[PDB]
Ligand binder design. Structure first.
Ligand SMILES: COc1ccc(CNC(C)=O)cc1
Length: 121
């Protein structure tokens, strides 16, 4: 139907917007600490600790399949990256601190993205 096409056009431009957002958020991780899933070969006990792993590569895969229906779904995944890290790693580690900095610096980006998604519809 025409309605379905219209819907798919909105999804496509949402995906376009979120691609930009994801790029800006990943720029705030210059150490690439969150770039790839935590290796279960190198960290064998990880899944005993973290029940829903997430990372930028995995988000990007979902993104390009147009798998984020709205900004909330995207933000959930971003928050998993940060929250998993702040639980698995202690406060005095480069990993925990990178998560804090990513959350802080990311807030600006996400604040504007929400306004753009709302405004553009
Ligand atoms: C192989 O060495 C490692 C692997 C993972 C981590 C923690 N990373 C995250 C995102 O939690 C630390 C050391």
């Amino acid at each position: 139907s025409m309605e379905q096409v219209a819907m798919e056009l909105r999804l496509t431009e949402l995906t376009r917007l979120l691609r930009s957002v994801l790029d800006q958020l990943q720029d705030k991780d210059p150490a690439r600490i969150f770039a790839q899933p935590v290796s279960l070969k190198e960290v064998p006990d990880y899944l005993d600790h973290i029940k829903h792993p997430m990372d930028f590569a995995t988000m990007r895969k979902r993104l390009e399949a147009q798998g984020y229906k709205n900004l909330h779904e995207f933000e959930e995944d971003f928050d998993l990256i940060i929250d998993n890290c702040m639980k698995y790693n202690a406060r005095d580690t480069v990993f925990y601190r990178a998560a804090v900095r990513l959350r802080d610096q990311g807030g600006v980006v996400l604040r504007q993205a929400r306004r753009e998604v709302d405004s553009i519809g």
